[PDB]
């Protein structure tokens, strides 16, 4: 059984590329207004959110736009839960709880790559900075697939975000700040 490793980038070139993208992306994401993301998404980009189907803070805020094809069967309801076009994509994102991610603790896997495609997954944690779940720690995996951007950047054409509650194991770790010992 291969030994579980962290982030996988393949080339330092894509590492710096992707990591840079995430810095800019989440700088805007946690800013208070995610509108600046309209430049990160393609005109006909897609976005959808999913949460665990299964007493920590509530995810009721994500339940409304939760897309689970395994559980939800109606083709028309399936279709509506999928945000299409950057306008709808970003309009939706701006409705989500304000956030503050731990970008530098992100574990990234670049799984696919061609001259026009770059698929990669992001795993990490983020605090909700307000609302009824303020100070709560969420965990998430987000998959983007990008096409080359006119500026050596990335244009996200596909974005699937999975939001969950950090497990007691993760929380313990994230918040630990013990005195140094030999």
């Amino acid at each position: 059984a291969p030994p579980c490793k962290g982030s996988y980038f393949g080339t330092e070139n894509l590492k710096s590329l992707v990591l840079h993208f995430l810095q800019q992306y989440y700088a805007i994401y946690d800013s208070g207004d995610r509108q600046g993301l309209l430049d990160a998404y393609h005109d006909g980009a897609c976005c959808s959110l999913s949460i665990p189907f299964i007493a920590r803070s509530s995810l009721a805020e994500y339940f409304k736009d939760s897309r689970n094809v395994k559980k939800l069967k109606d083709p028309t309801l399936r279709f509506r839960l999928l945000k299409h076009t950057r306008l709808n994509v970003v309009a939706f994102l701006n409705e989500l709880p304000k956030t503050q991610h731990d970008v530098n603790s992100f574990v990234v896997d670049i799984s696919a790559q061609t001259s026009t495609l770059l698929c990669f997954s992001v795993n990490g944690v983020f605090k909700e900075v307000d609302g009824k779940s303020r100070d709560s720690l969420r965990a998430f995996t987000r998959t983007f697939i990008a096409v080359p951007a006119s500026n050596s950047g990335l244009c996200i054409v596909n974005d699937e975000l999975f939001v969950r509650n950090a497990s007691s194991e993760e929380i313990q770790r994230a918040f630990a700040m013990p005195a140094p010992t030999p």
């Binding site: 790559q113 001259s115 495609l117 770059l118």
Partner: peptide, 6 residues
């Protein structure tokens, strides 16, 4: 296959 080049 470089991301972007073609």
């Amino acid at each position: 296959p470089g991301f972007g080049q073609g």
